[PDB]
């Protein structure tokens, strides 16, 4: 049991695509292997465990991993990525069978799923509220996964990463990115300009 490597610490797959997370170990003695998932606001949880009862292990939330002694690997797969599956994933190895003596974990792998934005119309809107603070913010929403939101050129203007909301009952998902300043000479013709799509409402 003394070791584990997780080759490839970040992974990005389109929703519907194969998830495949790697894990190899080094072991002086017969190893029992494990897989932990860590969804955003949460502690670790057990996806599946290898206790030498059988070679192809079935797990939870759709997952599966084949122990190959041949090549010293317990790689984890799900053939079809859900959005739900975005998490840090952890390999671990023990010397005793149920997980009872200590566990050595791997460095981990953060799985990212990219949504299938079916009917995108990119738009950049402007929102205001002057109750908490006189400020103005510009929403780059409804654009589509190909597109990415580059960081500011101006020091005193604040632009955040993209992000996917999903509205259960309407089968609808949409990307969105947020931009703001206090600066008087900033507007949303200024704001997102860097590799933005060439057909967005204003």
């Amino acid at each position: 049991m003394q070791s584990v490597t997780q080759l490839g610490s970040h992974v990005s797959v389109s929703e519907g695509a194969l998830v495949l997370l790697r894990c190899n170990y080094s072991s002086s003695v017969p190893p029992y292997l494990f897989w932990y998932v860590q969804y955003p606001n949460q502690g670790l949880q057990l996806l599946l465990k290898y206790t030498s009862a059988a070679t192809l292990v079935k797990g939870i939330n759709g997952f599966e991993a084949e122990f190959k002694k041949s090549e010293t690997s317990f790689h984890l797969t799900k053939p079809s990525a859900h959005m739900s599956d975005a998490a840090e994933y952890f390999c671990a190895v023990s010397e005793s069978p149920f997980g009872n003596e200590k566990l050595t974990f791997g460095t981990g792998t953060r799985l990212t799923i990219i949504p299938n934005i079916q009917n995108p119309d990119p738009a950049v809107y402007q929102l205001r509220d002057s109750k908490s603070s006189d400020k103005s913010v510009c929403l780059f929403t409804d654009f589509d996964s190909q597109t990415n939101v580059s960081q500011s050129k101006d020091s005193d203007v604040y632009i955040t990463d993209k992000c996917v909301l999903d509205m259960r009952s309407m089968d609808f998902k949409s990307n969105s990115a947020v931009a703001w300043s206090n600066k008087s000479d900033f507007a949303c013709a200024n704001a997102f300009n860097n590799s933005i799509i060439p057909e967005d409402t204003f």
């Binding site: 606001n41 952890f90 200590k102 974990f105 205001r128 509220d129 929403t141 259960r168």
Partner: protein
């Protein structure tokens, strides 16, 4: 069948000594302390296979550990340092039983170099664009939470009493208000989206809530701003015709 760790967030100061509790109600034999750091995964500091017994993990340096009772297992950092800033994770297992490790929730520690520069977030909400209603039949509110240090916010949306799953997105990670400042204040955005109608109703209350996790009661200061404790800062909102 549960493992708590007394604090869920903590602010401590370069040098200050630090106690972290860990406690289980399962009469369990082995307990462990790991730290989780980005890139490095989980790293075992120290462990205990019975009462009174400590043993060192892969990274025990400038850590110390106590097991007076079977329920308990405290971690101690002596002089706290900046790279002992991290996410600290307690686990317990039984030796007889076949049921494996039981993790705690975590304790996030931030160590800060010769000063407490901890401010709650101010939290402005913003209301959806005229164009968006018309164009997309949808309506996106935006909540910014701003001017906080360290990164200890937990941002939630609330509609008409009960919290909301759906149509939400908060920034995985915040951004620095000033990438100049070494210990720069932080800020975070979230979005809640809904149907046009739902917004066009002043029977619909929209609150954006942020919980800071800052200083505690026995912490020492009195400079000319509020005590930056573990308060909730909301902004609120109301639909329109």
């Amino acid at each position: 069948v549960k493992v708590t760790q007394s604090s869920r967030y903590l602010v401590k100061r370069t040098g200050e000594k630090v106690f972290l509790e860990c406690v289980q109600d399962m009469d369990h034999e082995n307990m462990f302390w790991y730290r989780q750091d980005p890139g490095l995964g989980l790293r075992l500091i120290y462990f205990s296979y019975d009462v009174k017994m400590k043993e060192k993990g892969d990274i025990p340096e400038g850590y110390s550990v106590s097991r007076e009772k079977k329920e308990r297992f405290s971690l101690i950092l002596e002089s706290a340092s900046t790279n002992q800033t991290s996410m600290y994770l307690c686990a317990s297992s039984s030796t007889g039983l076949p049921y494996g490790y039981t993790f705690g929730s975590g304790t996030r520690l931030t160590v800060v170099e010769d000063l407490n520069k901890v401010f709650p977030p101010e939290v402005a909400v913003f209301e959806p664009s005229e164009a968006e209603i018309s164009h997309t039949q949808k309506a996106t509110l935006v909540c910014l939470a701003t001017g906080f240090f360290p990164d200890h916010v937990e941002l939630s949306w609330w509609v008409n009493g009960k919290e909301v799953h759906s149509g939400v997105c908060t920034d995985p990670q915040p951004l620095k208000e000033q990438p100049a400042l070494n210990d720069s204040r932080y800020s975070l955005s979230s979005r809640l989206r809904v149907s046009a109608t739902f917004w066009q109703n002043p029977r619909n209350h929209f609150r954006c809530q942020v919980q800071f996790y800052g200083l505690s009661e026995n912490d020492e200061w009195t400079q000319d701003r509020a005590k930056p404790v573990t308060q909730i800062v909301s902004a609120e909102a109301w639909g329109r015709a």
